[PDB]
Amino acid sequence: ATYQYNMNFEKLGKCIIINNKNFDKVTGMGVRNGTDKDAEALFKCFRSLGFDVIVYNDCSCAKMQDLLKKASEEDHTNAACFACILLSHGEENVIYGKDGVTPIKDLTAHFRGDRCKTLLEKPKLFFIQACRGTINDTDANPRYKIPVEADFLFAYSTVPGYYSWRSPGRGSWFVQALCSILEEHGKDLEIMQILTRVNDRVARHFKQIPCVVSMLTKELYFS
Amino acid sequence: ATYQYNMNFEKLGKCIIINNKNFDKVTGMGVRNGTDKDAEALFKCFRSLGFDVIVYNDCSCAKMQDLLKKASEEDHTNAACFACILLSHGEENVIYGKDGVTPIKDLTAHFRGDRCKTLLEKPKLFFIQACRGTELDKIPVEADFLFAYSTVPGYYSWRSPGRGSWFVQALCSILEEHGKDLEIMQILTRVNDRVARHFESQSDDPHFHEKKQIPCVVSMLTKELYFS
Amino acid sequence: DEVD
Amino acid sequence: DEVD
Ligand SMILES: [Cl-]
Ligand SMILES: [Cl-]
User: Fold this and answer.
1) Which residues contact B20 (CB under 8 A, 6 or more apart)?
2) Under an 8 A CB cutoff, do B200 and A142 touch?
3) Where do the segments described as Loop L1 lie (chain A)?
4) Active-site residue A131, yes or no?
């Protein structure tokens, strides 16, 4: 009860997928073939969880910041949680937009406890398929005041030092492993159980080392 | 059973605690009062789990790298896992020794599968009480690694001079109560909630008064971890 | 296989 | 309180 996130809302929440395939010449990054199959697969396996999935394609850095800012300004009162999936190139601490790079923490900053009150005390999930190279109070009352970075979870396809692999004709191993486990155990297992299995699935595929960065305060079941 | 780590070994594993309290004057780092309570409390709650705990105080950067290197050179064949707790000052990607800083990933690099065969496919646990950059408030890691940070990069890691650090207080409190029952992520999630709700900073400087802290768990684990 |  |  008090150790699980309250999932008794009218809807599970919004899931925003940013699918970056084609990049400007000045970025020096090539076409990400196979990411369309990832986005479509992610669309299906997340709709099944109960998420209202929205897919954007080839977004510039300003575009990525704007749509996430707009989404954080929506009314999530009757929503249980929020999810965001990023499919693009990436270096350390940054994700690639169509025209360049933008700090990942700049994208997630919009959903902090002090900036997004309707998602306060609610799970905020970020799934990131990419390489990784190598402030006010939430409340005036100290009794309800929580850290602004609380209830955040990050699921990276890899760790800094290793590559994030993607099959041009099939898609990334991380997405395939993620959707597969969500289809089978997305309604019965806790989020860390699901992601731990994801880490194993990609590991036994053999380098690529997926990881989870969790600031969650409760256990997360998709009920 | 096939989704858990095999815990059927003679011992749970080795646990090294590095307790850095006093630092050289050249560093300009103050005394970390309360860390002695932390080190002793951690000694108790980790021994209760079944760890072989050893505590070192005020280690240099060379010493810290040495004792962890010597640890990875030991035989962990009959051990289920390995744990290491770091208690000191710190910044982004680095932790303070008595004579300066040293990168955290250099400390953990010794326990990688290619340098530590007897710990291959066994969980390596690293608990770190230190600041990780405060502007708001490289050898790669591997699978079966877990980092339990006291805070999020960019934010402070608080410590009560008379009671100890918030993260350690919460950690042993959860471990003594549910350490034998819950999976490692369940424990750390409750630690997150405990630190996030029970504590707020005390200072006559209103800018640093009643500030909040959320720990950060980085898991590369491939299986579930029960200490029993 | 390509990398990101 | 103190910081690390
Ligand atoms: Cl494609
Ligand atoms: Cl002390």
Assistant:
1) B32, B35, B57, B58, B59, B87, B88, B89, B96, B97, B98
2) yes
3) 21-32
4) yes
Contacts of A30 in chain C (CB under 8 A): 2
Which residues of chain A have a CB within 8 Å of the CB of B215?
Answer: 215
B177-203 burial: b if 16+ Cβ within 10 Å, else e: eebeebbbbbbbbbbbbbbbbebbbee
The b-or-e profile of B162-173 (16+ CB within 10 A means b, else e) is eebbbbbbbbbb
Contacts of B10 (CB under 8 A, 6+ apart): B78, B79
Decide if B189 touches A, using CB distance below 8 A. Answer: yes
Does chain A touch chain B (at least 3 C-beta pairs within 8 Å)?
yes
Spatial contact of B38 and B75, defined as CB atoms under 8 Å apart: no
Structure-token match 């997926």, residue found: A210
- Give the ligand whose atoms come closest to the C-alpha of residue A35: 1
Amino acid at B169: Q
The experimental method behind these coordinates is X-ray
Query: In this complex, which of A33, A130, A157 lies closest to C2 when CB atoms are compared?
Result: A33
When the candidates are 3.40.50.2300, 3.40.225.10, 3.30.460.10, 3.40.50.1460, the CATH number that belongs to B1-228 is 3.40.50.1460
A209/A177 Cα distance (integer angstroms):
13
Q: A169 CA to middle of ligand 2, Å?
A: 59
User: How many Cβ atoms from other residues are within 10 Å of residue A162's Cβ?
Assistant: 20
Bridge partner residues of B116 (DSSP): none
Q: What is the resolution of this structure in A?
A: 2.1
Neighbours of ion ligand 1 (CB under 5 A): A 33-34, 36
Q: Nearest residue of C to residue A20 by CA position?
A: C4
Q: Which residues of chain B neighbour D1 with C-beta distances below 8 Å?
A: 158-161, 201-203
Q: How far apart are CA B104 and CA B128, in angstroms?
A: 9
d(CA B163, CA B227): 27
